[PDB]
């Protein structure tokens, strides 16, 4: 039994526990069980993996999982999503720096605790449902089958405190005929470290994250698959997940209610530039283990299906040009309690009731 605990502004206290065994019983397969829990999510999985599906090193992996997501505890407009499902994945090493993945998946989603609101109800209508704008207690359940694909490039010089190279991760998903939902979703993440000096003590880091998904035919992508932005890992200085569209609630039993409750969206773009330098005023020998950075972060999340014509007087959440921006300082080092990172950032471009969070940290 391997345990772990962490603490941060993004998810509060995180617990992790798991067991793993390669070459179980001399069969050649690895078997694992692991779980994680934080302020808004409980996740558990069982895994079986053959690292030599072919002699060449193609791996075949299987996953059985359960997940419990509480949207309001993740700083979104409220809902509960209890899910479970399976995945079978083929993994291809291309060379030492590149890997490819292709897999098939099943997922069951059970949605509840949804208050009537424009974007969610719009998705339900696209699914052929006719919920009333005063329905407080509906549940929605779906069974989806997917094709999943991925590509990872990693040529960073080292895992901890990188100074040179790039990492790129592309991940995509599309539903298979027979699913309830019909949609696709693609994500791209990049990070590139460019050292200035031969010593690699001064480094420029550029990061990007892109995301796009949409429904097929008349259907929309499910809102419980939306992208988010804001927080320690995307746009610092903003509360986790606050960036982008906000829920518009229907009157109880009048007019609509604007809120500041983030709902995410089906399109997202985030970029960051930061200047990694030696740490001033520090004692000698601490310097190599303590990394200071000055950053400029920026990001947007938007809703390509927002019908601006129907909601006159409300913000146009389909507009992709409301780019949030912040600047600030970060410090990172290894402590007795594990990896330590914190930042002070000031948002200087905000929109649509985004919530600020200047001081953000993570331990573990």
């Amino acid at each position, epitope marked *: 039994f391997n345990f772990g605990i962490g603490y941060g502004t993004e998810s509060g206290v995180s617990f992790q526990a798991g067991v793993q065994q390669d070459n179980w019983l001399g069969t050649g397969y690895a078997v694992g069980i692991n779980g994680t829990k934080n302020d808004y999510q409980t996740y558990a999985e069982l895994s079986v993996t053959n690292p030599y599906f072919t002699v060449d090193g193609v791996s075949l992996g299987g996953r059985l999982f359960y997940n419990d997501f509480q949207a309001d505890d993740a700083d979104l407009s409220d809902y509960t999503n209890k899910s479970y499902g399976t995945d079978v994945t083929l993994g291809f090493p291309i060379n030492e720096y590149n890997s490819l993945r292709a897999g098939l998946g099943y997922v069951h989603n059970s949605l509840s605790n949804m208050q009537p609101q424009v974007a969610m109800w719009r998705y*339900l209508y696209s*699914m*052929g*449902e*006719h*919920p*009333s704008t005063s*329905d407080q*207690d*509906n*549940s*929605f*359940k*779906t069974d989806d089958f997917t094709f999943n694909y991925g590509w990872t490039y990693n040529k960073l010089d080292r895992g901890y405190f990188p100074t040179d190279g790039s990492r790129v991760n592309l991940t995509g998903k599309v539903t298979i005929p027979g699913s*309830d939902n019909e949609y696709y979703k693609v994500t791209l993440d990049t990070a590139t470290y460019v050292p200035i000096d031969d010593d690699h003590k001064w480094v420029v880091l550029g990061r990007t994250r892109w995301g796009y998904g949409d429904g097929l035919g008349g259907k929309e992508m499910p809102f419980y698959e939306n992208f988010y932005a804001g927080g320690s890992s995307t746009v610092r200085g903003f509360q986790s997940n606050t960036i982008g569209p906000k829920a518009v609630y229907f009157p109880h039993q009048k007019d609509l209610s604007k809120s500041d409750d983030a709902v995410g969206g089906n399109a997202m773009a985030v970029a960051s530039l930061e200047f990694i330098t030696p740490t001033p005023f520090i004692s000698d020998k601490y310097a190599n283990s303590v990394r200071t950075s000055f950053f400029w972060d920026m990001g947007t999340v938007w809703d390509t299906n927002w019908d601006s014509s129907q909601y006159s007087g409300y913000p146009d959440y389909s507009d992709p040009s409301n780019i949030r921006m912040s600047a600030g300082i970060a410090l990172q080092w290894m402590s007795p309690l594990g990896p330590l990172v914190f930042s002070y950032a000031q948002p200087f471009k905000k929109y649509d009731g985004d919530k600020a969070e200047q001081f953000q940290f993570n331990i573990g």
Partner: nanobody, 122 residues
Framework: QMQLVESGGGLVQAGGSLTLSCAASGRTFSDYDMGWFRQAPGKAREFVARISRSGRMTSLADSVKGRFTISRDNGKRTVYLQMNSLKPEDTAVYYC???????????????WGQGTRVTVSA
């Protein structure tokens, strides 16, 4: 004219469970939102649960939240009521109902079954 026939009602002990079924005649079952209602002796009929044409959307009365579940099988032209953790207050005749409209089927319907009786003893 579509007919609805409920079955599954019986005598059950408090804490036990039961599954009701409602079978529909004809080939138009998927055209209808479906509902379960119940009527205790001396009282008016009352809403219990409903389910959309597709089977994906459901809702439940407050008195059965967390205990009852509604589902349907459009291939078998059947809607089900799964009743767990039963109490003596659940004793009643249970009726199946069908209506073209989701919002209406919470209070009434175009088509009604003849009911199936459930008795929960303490």
């Amino acid at each position: 004219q579509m007919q609805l026939v409920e079955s599954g009602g019986g005598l059950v002990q408090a804490g036990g469970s039961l599954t009701l079924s409602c079978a529909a005649s004809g080939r138009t079952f998927s055209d209808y939102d479906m509902g379960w209602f119940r009527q205790a002796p001396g009282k008016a009929r009352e809403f219990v649960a409903r389910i959309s044409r597709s089977g994906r959307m459901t809702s439940l009365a407050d008195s059965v939240k967390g205990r009852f579940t509604i589902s349907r099988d459009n291939g078998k032209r059947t809607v089900y009521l799964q009743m767990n953790s039963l109490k003596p207050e659940d004793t009643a005749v249970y009726y199946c109902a069908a209506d073209p409209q989701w919002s209406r089927v919470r209070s009434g319907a175009d088509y009604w079954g003849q009911g199936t009786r459930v008795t929960v003893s303490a």
